[PDB]
Design a protein around this ligand. Structure first.
Ligand code: HEM
Ligand code: HEM
Ligand SMILES: CC1(C)SCCN(S(=O)(=O)c2ccc(Oc3ccncc3)cc2)[C@H]1C(=O)NO
Ligand SMILES: CC1(C)SCCN(S(=O)(=O)c2ccc(Oc3ccncc3)cc2)[C@H]1C(=O)NO
Ligand code: NI
Lengths: 465, 457
């Protein structure tokens, strides 16, 4: 029994909400109805969850009943079916359990811990440092490079190799990724996911997700290319391989989720994901570093103390670096990359902050409202690294810190992300000092929304130390 | 008190449920609200019933309160009135009782048992085998032939004659039937229907008027000084008597509808199942082989099949039953309506609520069959290997409204099916991709187009 806008007939609230700037409308509504309001976009019932309490209660307290995902019809066009749901949007069930366990364990096994992947990231972090350096003096937009660098890490783990920063196929992938991402929000997608005006209306059904489809077919190419060379006798060296060997081990039953339709989706899930997240965060990192050179200096120091200005950073350093760690965690809290997170759905009736949400209710965990809950952080809306430091000056991670959400569905890439961030971030400041272009206006801290929110375009100066 | 979408004043939920692919939206909804949800398509209240329990409960347990049918306005266009509702869509009442009892009894007497119809089917089964064979080597689409063959059985029992596979009028009838069938679905149907407002059933009308023609010539060849030779005659003999009785359903307007109900029905169902049968046999030659053997054991490769053989044939019987379960031809069955308030799986359904028995969810209930979405003949076999029919096997639904053609269908299937595999071995065309097992939805769901090779044994 949560309050609500009470939408007009037919389209419901489909119109009362601005889908090109959702974060905004949801706050304007949490202002009228507050924390736990509800809207009915078309036939679909919804319940937006604001503030730490309402989020932790649904995702953790009643986690066993909110681990499902609401069905997303318009994904038929990408080849999603019961026989293949990948992970990201797979419904709570065994096909999802299987792929979730495969993902977490396989990545871990591919060296996601110490010595291996950790140095695969420093190898790649080098190639990035150089590309940066190769732009001596002249200011520029780092977004693109970071994106390539980070994507090369997820490529290593999934496709078995890295790509040259000049490779056209690589850059096409990156572009399609950023464009398919944008198609994850927007009025169009919403309306087709409500009114079946998409069945036999190619004009509509075609244009939507035109990039997501274009992105997936670029991968199928990479996969078939990749699968052609797969030699069973060699233990798997990348996710694709590990998956194919499972498709073999599970030749037995047609019930297994290890099959050709799933392979592209699971691989696409992880590839795309590790390709447009950390990267965006690293853009927020660098921006906030030129917008706050004072904090950049402090971190740049801690690096020289423990790590030194000559040897590459190692995960084992984070332990001895409380400031670099708090800055990074703050970059994430303030960066607030996935505002409304990822839609969940109730498996049975639940109660949150008093109201009672019925089964089949789409849940929208507004992680921004947690990442910046007024009743939690000292200075919520300002960049305050001391948010992760106690009196003695030792790093401390607060509960409200949920950039990866929580529950059975919590981001399964957190491990990779933590490592990527710390290694690329420090390796960058270790060998660099960034600042705003000498004669340019101070860059905006406002972010652009497209499901994921990145730092409004900006340039910076990269000079060596 | 069943869970379900928010009902908006507007035009109700009637605006957001894919009617060109309904089986899909109802499962995407049973995934959100589960097994017993409800929608309000316009003014009308509806309650979809998923899974064996909810179905058996409404149709069997509270059968006395769910045997009616919701009114379907759009059918005024076809000549449906209280004086004539046929059977299929007839509202629970005397008019329906009379027609239903006439139907099952009359058909039974027209030989629907043994020796007679049974060999009228073998006779036609032959004509079929031939047309197949006359396509030596060259692969082809069996859909059309099967349709004509099975249609000739329903024609025999109701129009008293069979049709040449080349007859124009016959072929016209078949086409209209498959086109009118398509009209029993869609968006514009739900709309005009849930909002009575105009050239809509152009093909169902077209179908019925082709029959009126056939009905007219029939009265002419009918010799009333002889025991009924077929259904239509039997109906006219009933009418004659009903002269001067305003309460009888045996009247001119009902004659065409009753006849059309049975004719079109036995013309687009069994046929579709037989297409499912042949498909799953080229997609599973391994099972085709085993049945083809049981055939040569009991029946032999030369004498025509007889119903009396099903008893001694556990495998062919289980394959056929599984072809039906998996075939899953009438997914959402036929809408029923509550006569009074009842309760299903806890919730309370009000009087006047249209019921949608999702027979697919029964035919493929996760809590009943071993391997629900795979072709598993062993689904009707115990340890010993003797055929056994499970409760959840409800392709004909259940209750006072259960398909009144089940007897004819059982026979048609067994005899056409076995006679086909007996004198044939089907396979996918030598150099073509493996056929899809996904079916196309249009009220009834048929096997996505496909070709097969028919070579003799
Ligand atoms: C700093 C970077 C990242 C952030 C902030 C982020 C955060 C999130 C969040 C908030 C969710 C939704 C959780 C929910 O449904 O409640 C999610 C989903 C998930 N993330 Fe990430 N993510 C990042 C990195 C990545 C990376 C690098 C990968 C890939 C290896 C990835 C893999 C996934 C997957 C597969 C899911 C779906 C999990 C499931 O449904 O079970 N993410 N992420
Ligand atoms: C492949 C074979 C067939 C299948 C799967 C099938 C199935 C069904 C189903 C599911 C119903 C609706 C039951 C309900 O009220 O809930 C129905 C009813 C009906 N069927 Fe069939 N059918 C088939 C064969 C036939 C044949 C061969 C005839 C023709 C004599 C026919 C005549 C009827 C009639 C007249 C009804 C309406 C019965 C009533 O309202 O009392 N069906 N059928
Ligand atoms: C495999 C697909 C191409 S299928 C079509 C849509 N996308 S996408 O590239 O637009 C995308 C990328 C990231 C995302 O959000 C995430 C994921 C992980 N961590 C944090 C945020 C959502 C959607 C891919 C997808 O489903 N990925 O999950
Ligand atoms: C008499 C009518 C011409 S009135 C207009 C529509 N049709 S039709 O040819 O399109 C048709 C055929 C089969 C069907 O479904 C069945 C029947 C029996 N068993 C399982 C499924 C539904 C609709 C005729 C009709 O109502 N027949 O019942
Ligand atoms: Ni006659």
């Amino acid at each position: 029994l949560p309050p609500g806008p009470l939408p007009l007939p037919g389209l419901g609230n489909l119109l009362h909400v601005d889908f090109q700037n959702t974060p905004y409308c949801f706050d304007q509504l949490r202002r009228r109805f507050g924390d736990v309001f509800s809207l009915q976009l078309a036939w679909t019932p919804v319940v937006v969850l604001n503030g730490l309490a309402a989020v932790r209660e649904a995702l953790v307290t009643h986690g066993e009943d909110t681990a499902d995902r609401p069905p997303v019809p318009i994904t038929q066009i990408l080849g999603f079916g019961p026989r293949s749901q990948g992970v990201f949007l797979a419904r709570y069930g065994p096909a999802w359990r299987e792929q979730r366990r495969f993902s977490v364990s396989t990545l871990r096994n591919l060296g996601l811990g110490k010595k291996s992947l950790e140095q695969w990231v420093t190898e790649e972090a080098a190639c990035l440092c150089a590309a940066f350096a190769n732009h001596s003096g002249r200011p520029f937009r780092p977004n693109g490079l970071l994106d390539k660098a980070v994507s090369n890490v997820i490529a290593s783990l999934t496709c078995g190799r890295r790509f040259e920063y000049d490779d056209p196929r690589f850059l096409r992938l990156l572009d399609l990724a950023q464009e398919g991402l944008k198609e994850e929000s927007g009025f169009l997608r919403e309306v087709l996911n409500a009114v079946p005006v998409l069945l036999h209306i190619p004009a509509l059904a075609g244009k939507v997700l035109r990039f997501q489809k274009a992105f997936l077919t670029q991968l199928d190419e990479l996969l078939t290319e990749h699968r052609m060379t797969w030699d069973p006798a060699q233990p798997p060296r990348d996710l694709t391989e590990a998956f194919l060997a499972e498709m073999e081990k599970a030749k037995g039953n047609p019930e297994s989720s290890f099959n050709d339709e799933n392979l592209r989706i699971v691989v696409a899930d992880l590839f795309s994901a590790g390709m447009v997240t950390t990267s965006t965060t690293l853009a927020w990192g660098l921006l906030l570093m030129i917008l706050h050179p004072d904090v950049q200096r402090r971190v740049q120091q801690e690096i020289d103390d423990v790590i030194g200005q000559v040897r590459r950073p190692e995960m084992g350093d984070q332990a001895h670096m409380p400031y670099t760690t708090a800055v990074i965690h703050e970059v994430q809290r303030f960066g607030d990359i996935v505002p409304l997170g990822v839609t969940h759905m109730t498996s049975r009736d639940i109660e949150v902050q008093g109201f009672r949400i019925p089964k089949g209710t789409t849940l929208i965990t507004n992680l921004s409202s947690v990442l910046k809950d007024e009743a939690v952080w000292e200075k919520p809306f300002r960049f305050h690294p001391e948010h992760f430091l106690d009196a003695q000056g030792h790093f401390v991670k607060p509960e409200a810190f949920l950039p990866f959400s929580a529950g059975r569905r919590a981001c399964l890439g957190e491990p990779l992300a933590r490592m990527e961030l710390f290694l690329f971030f420090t390796s960058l400041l270790q060998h660099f000092s960034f600042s705003v272009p000498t004669g340019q206006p101070r860059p905006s801290h406002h972010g652009v929304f497209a499901f994921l929110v990145s730092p409004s375009p900006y340039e910076l100066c990269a000079v060596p130390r």
